[PDB]
Amino acid sequence: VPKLTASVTDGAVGVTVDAPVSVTAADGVLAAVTMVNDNGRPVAGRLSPDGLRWSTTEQLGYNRRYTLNATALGLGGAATRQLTFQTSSPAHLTMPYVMPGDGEVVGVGEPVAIRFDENIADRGAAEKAIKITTNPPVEGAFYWLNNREVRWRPEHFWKPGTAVDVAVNTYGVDLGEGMFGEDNVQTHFTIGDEVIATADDNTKILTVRVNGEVVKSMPTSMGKDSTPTANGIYIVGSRYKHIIMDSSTYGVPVNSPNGYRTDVDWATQISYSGVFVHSAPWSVGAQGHTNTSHGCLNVSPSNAQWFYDHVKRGDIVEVVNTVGGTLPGIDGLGDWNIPWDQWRAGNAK
Numbered sequence: 001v002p003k004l005t006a007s008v009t010d011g012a013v014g015v016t017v018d019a020p021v022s023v024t025a026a027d028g029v030l031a032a033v034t035m036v037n038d039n040g041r042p043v044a045g046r047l048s049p050d051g052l053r054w055s056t057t058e059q060l061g062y063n064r065r066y067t068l069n070a071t072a073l074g075l076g077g078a079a080t081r082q083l084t085f086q087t088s089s090p091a092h093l094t095m096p097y098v099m100p101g102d103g104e105v106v107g108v109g110e111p112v113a114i115r116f117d118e119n120i121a122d123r124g125a126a127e128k129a130i131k132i133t134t135n136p137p138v139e140g141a142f143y144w145l146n147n148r149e150v151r152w153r154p155e156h157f158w159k160p161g162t163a164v165d166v167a168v169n170t171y172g173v174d175l176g177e178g179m180f181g182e183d184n185v186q187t188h189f190t191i192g193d194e195v196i197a198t199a200d201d202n203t204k205i206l207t208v209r210v211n212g213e214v215v216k217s218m219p220t221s222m223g224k225d226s227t228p229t230a231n232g233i234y235i236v237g238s239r240y241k242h243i244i245m246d247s248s249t250y251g252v253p254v255n256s257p258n259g260y261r262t263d264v265d266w267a268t269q270i271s272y273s274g275v276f277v278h279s280a281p282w283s284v285g286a287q288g289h290t291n292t293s294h295g296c297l298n299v300s301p302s303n304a305q306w307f308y309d310h311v312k313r314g315d316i317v318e319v320v321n322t323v324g325g326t327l328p329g330i331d332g333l334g335d336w337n338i339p340w341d342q343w344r345a346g347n348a349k
């Protein structure tokens, strides 16, 4: 009589819902397979045209018992079998969020970023659950910026024209301490032109190169000796036509001798610490000459609008020869400052 097998065992508990459930017949074919929960409600499934295999086709629930009934028929007669199992019971759930967004074109410095809404106790599990495909294929690695957010990138800047596909398959995965993913997420993005803007404190010029060729030179005024602009590699983030930077958000009042409420135009963010390339009509005389800022890359209004218009998320700004230190690797936009042996060795433990 037909031989029935299933991907789950009768009486199992803690069965993970990261995978469909399947049933196979040998020495015959499946006539029908049904899988029901404890209220009698069927799980969607599909029988192969040949009749040799069946699978669930929709996500299974947490904390559920399921009963699986299968009948097979062959040139030996029939067999009908039944099994029940119980799925994982999470202590807690987290939902991942992945950047950059689906369909976007980004620059050559843009990492994959997966942020969870809860602390991740088993970083290795989260990594293994995240599948990144690249075309052309390129080696990269995971590194945690904090307890919630993991980044992935290659050793070198991405090559333009690279397709990146990201499947965060965290549904049904135990991410440590009984914390399971609430649901999978996907995204797909493309790497565009190589755009690297270099600000050299010896020239006070910000030179924007596309694919190695100069397209723009901007006089700049970067951070005063006292509040210097850090050297290193910065990843371009968000852009704002207009933004208000306000002392008293931290707790220094506007009406204090270090207070300010500054209207700023054409502002392209390049570190979570607060470095922007923006419009600085008030320091155009100092641009190309003398550092005057709190550590933003001050350029002229129309140079700032050019940057806002022509630089995208993931492009790169490199600062060199200033009196600051180096941008932290875990700034949020400072990933490329971590040397490759360290980045690749990761910090999953």
Ligand SMILES: *C(=O)[C@@H](C(C)=O)[C@@H]1C[C@H](SCNCN)[C@@H](C(=O)O)N1
Pocket (backbone or CB within 6 Å): 245, 262, 272, 273, 274, 275, 276, 293, 294, 295, 296, 297
């Ligand atoms: C740039 O040097 C500054 C101004 C007033 O032009 C700059 C904007 C940022 S705020 C963004 N995040 C909060 N820190 C800060 C800075 O520290 O650079 N001041």
